[PDB]
Amino acid sequence: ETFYSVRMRASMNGGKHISGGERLIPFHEMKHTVNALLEKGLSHSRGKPDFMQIQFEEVHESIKTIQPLPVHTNEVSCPEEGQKLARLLLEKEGVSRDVIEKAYEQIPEWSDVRGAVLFDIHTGKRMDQTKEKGVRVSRMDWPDANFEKWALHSHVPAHSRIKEALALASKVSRHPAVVAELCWSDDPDYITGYVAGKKMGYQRITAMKEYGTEEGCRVFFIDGSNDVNTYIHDLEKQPILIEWEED
Amino acid sequence: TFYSVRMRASMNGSHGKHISGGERLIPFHEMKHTVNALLEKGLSHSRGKPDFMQIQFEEVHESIKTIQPLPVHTNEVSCPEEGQKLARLLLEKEGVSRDVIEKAYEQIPEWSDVRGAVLFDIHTGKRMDQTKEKGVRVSRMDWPDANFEKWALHSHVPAHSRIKEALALASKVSRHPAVVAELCWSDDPDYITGYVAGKKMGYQRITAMKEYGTEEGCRVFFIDGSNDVNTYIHDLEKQPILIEWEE
Ligand SMILES: Nc1ncnc2c1ncn2[C@@H]1O[C@H](COP(=O)(O)OC(=O)CCCCCC(=O)O)[C@@H](O)[C@H]1O
Ligand SMILES: Nc1ncnc2c1ncn2[C@@H]1O[C@H](COP(=O)(O)OC(=O)CCCCCC(=O)O)[C@@H](O)[C@H]1O
Ligand SMILES: [Mg+2]
Ligand SMILES: [Mg+2]
Ligand SMILES: [Pt+2]
Ligand SMILES: [Pt+2]
Ligand SMILES: [Pt+2]
Ligand SMILES: [Pt+2]
Ligand SMILES: [Pt+2]
Ligand SMILES: [Pt+2]
Numbered sequence: 001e002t003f004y005s006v007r008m009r010a011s012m013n014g015g016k017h018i019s020g021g022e023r024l025i026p027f028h029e030m031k032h033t034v035n036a037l038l039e040k041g042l043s044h045s046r047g048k049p050d051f052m053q054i055q056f057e058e059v060h061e062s063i064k065t066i067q068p069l070p071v072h073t074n075e076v077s078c079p080e081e082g083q084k085l086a087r088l089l090l091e092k093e094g095v096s097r098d099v100i101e102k103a104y105e106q107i108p109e110w111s112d113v114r115g116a117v118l119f120d121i122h123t124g125k126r127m128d129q130t131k132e133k134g135v136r137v138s139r140m141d142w143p144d145a146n147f148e149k150w151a152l153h154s155h156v157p158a159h160s161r162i163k164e165a166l167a168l169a170s171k172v173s174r175h176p177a178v179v180a181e182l183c184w185s186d187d188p189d190y191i192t193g194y195v196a197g198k199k200m201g202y203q204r205i206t207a208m209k210e211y212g213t214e215e216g217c218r219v220f221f222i223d224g225s226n227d228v229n230t231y232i233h234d235l236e237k238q239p240i241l242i243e244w245e246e247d
Numbered sequence: 248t249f250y251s252v253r254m255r256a257s258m259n260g261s262h263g264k265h266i267s268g269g270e271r272l273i274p275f276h277e278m279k280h281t282v283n284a285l286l287e288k289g290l291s292h293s294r295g296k297p298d299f300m301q302i303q304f305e306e307v308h309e310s311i312k313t314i315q316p317l318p319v320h321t322n323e324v325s326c327p328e329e330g331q332k333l334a335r336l337l338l339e340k341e342g343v344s345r346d347v348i349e350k351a352y353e354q355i356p357e358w359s360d361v362r363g364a365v366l367f368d369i370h371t372g373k374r375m376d377q378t379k380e381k382g383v384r385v386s387r388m389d390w391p392d393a394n395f396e397k398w399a400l401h402s403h404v405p406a407h408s409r410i411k412e413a414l415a416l417a418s419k420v421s422r423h424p425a426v427v428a429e430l431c432w433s434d435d436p437d438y439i440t441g442y443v444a445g446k447k448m449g450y451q452r453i454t455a456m457k458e459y460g461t462e463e464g465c466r467v468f469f470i471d472g473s474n475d476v477n478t479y480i481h482d483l484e485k486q487p488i489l490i491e492w493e494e
Contacts, residue, residue, distance in 0.1 A: 004298075030286075030290070031283075031286065034282070034286055034302075035279075035283070038278075038279065038282055042278070050250075050305065050306040051304070051305050051306070052303065052304050052305075053301065053302070053303045054282075054301070054302045054303070055299075055300065055301045055302070056299070056300050057260075057261065057298065057299045057300075058298035058299070
């Protein structure tokens with residue numbers, strides 16, 4: 001009854017990143033999961049790939065189980081309104097306005113980062129040295145049956161895109177060096193994003209960009225005296241399962 | 248357009264004891280079936296269940312050469328020591344000097360861990376490649392099943408995919424002008440038939456090359472060429488070949 005990390009990446013054609021996925025599962029779900037990842041890479045709205053890697057490996061570290069972040073959905077009528085709300089939420093979560101503004105000026109240049117960017121709240125600058133690779137959070141997952149119940153109860157659609165985002169966001173927010181996350185999709189067909197943090201949980205914002213744009217974003221705002229490589233190793237390696245508790 | 252699809256699997260981490268490997272060359276619309284076949288093949292291998300696996304695909308741009316399989320002849324022997332003796336004889340008849348053969352047989356035991364093939368230079372009486380435990384992995388060859396089944400029927404050989412794969416590989420490799428001979432037997436404890444292959448005598452199966460239950464296998468290509476080893480490695484890894492038999 002050991003668990004397995006299963007990862008996928010796909011690209012078209014410096015190939016254009018198409019898709020990526022990370023799962024953490026018991027062995028008997030291997031076929032379904034390899035197939036799900038396969039399908040997800042093949043039928044992606046960003047294009048059809050000519051390169052793909054799928055990989056699995058046994059996880060030896062013990063698995064921590066946590067609840068998902070509390071969720072609140074902020075209806076907005078347009079992107080400029082959502083982005084404005086997001087900047088306000090980041091501030092209320094503890095990021096200084098100047099650090100936010102500095103980050104927003106560089107977000108456009110980070111659109112091609114395949115993973116996430118780490119931004120130091122002390123130095124007002126990018127902290128990681130992974131460049132276009134970014135920091136890829138992995139070994140987190142949310143068993144589907146539990147997620148469906150959570151969706152039902154939370155009156156949210158049971159879209160796997162939400163399951164994956166919230167699993168990621170809950171793992172990342174747990175890290176003591178992470179004050180906040182800002183995310184929206186690089187998929188032209190999906191405009192909802194979020195801001196997430198310990199105090200205000202997972203704050204969905206229903207419009208963060210215009211349809212048809214392919215620029216997405218993932219930034220983790222970091223407050224830590226420790227070195228960045230420690231934080232990177234935690235985000236990449238530490239296994240997390242989400243389990244929401246009905247009571 | 249065609250796609251190279253590759254798999255490797257190991258136990259006790261990645262390349263750890265090598266469990267399985269596979270290489271396919273297919274049109275895009277056979278991707279799901281082929282990813283699944285490779286998955287299945289790694290999961291149910293007689294050498295153990297893996298705790299690591301990689302499956303990968305990529306578009307092939309080089310144009311595809313189609314060739315006939317090597318002529319086949321089956322040598323019945325009563326024991327391993329006899330098959331090995333016959334194999335040494337066949338290698339000599341194919342053009343390898345006795346001294347080079349003996350030198351190779353002294354090293355074969357330490358090469359059991361090589362995940363791919365070993366290249367042995369007839370000019371130096373020594374190993375030619377610098378890949379150590381990785382070895383040289385031949386790929387981008389395949390034999391459409393329908394055609395293979397006919398060939399098996401007509402040749403009075405069992406239509407086992409293990410033979411399809413070995414003969415596809417041996418035919419690609421023997422075509423390379425710098426390859427005088429190949430010596431192979433399986434690293435699978437349940438399969439004791441091996442072969443020697445070359446241009447003059449084709450694909451010579453030897454029905455006993457080791458004792459049942461041993462996991463030491465072998466794959467050595469004897470090289471006589473005027474070029475550097477990296478060229479030959481690139482040819483073996485990169486030249487796309489489909490087998491198509493005709494009477
Ligand atoms: N595992 C990861 N680790 C770090 N960054 C990642 C990871 N996966 C994706 N990213 C980065 O995040 C960017 C966005 O990727 P995507 O998968 O397109 O992101 C989304 O779908 C976000 C959806 C949030 C709203 C869901 C909801 O309705 O509640 C992508 O470009 C990468 O830069
Ligand atoms: N694609 C490759 N490229 C280079 N070396 C390879 C490759 N595939 C396998 N090898 C090497 O060969 C070794 C064993 O390969 P296996 O897949 O175990 O090979 C076999 O089943 C051999 C079949 C013998 C003849 C079949 C028959 O006519 O009845 C393996 O451990 C590697 O070291
Ligand atoms: Mg094989
Ligand atoms: Mg084998
Ligand atoms: Pt493209
Ligand atoms: Pt394309
Ligand atoms: Pt607040
Ligand atoms: Pt083992
Ligand atoms: Pt094992
Ligand atoms: Pt001969």
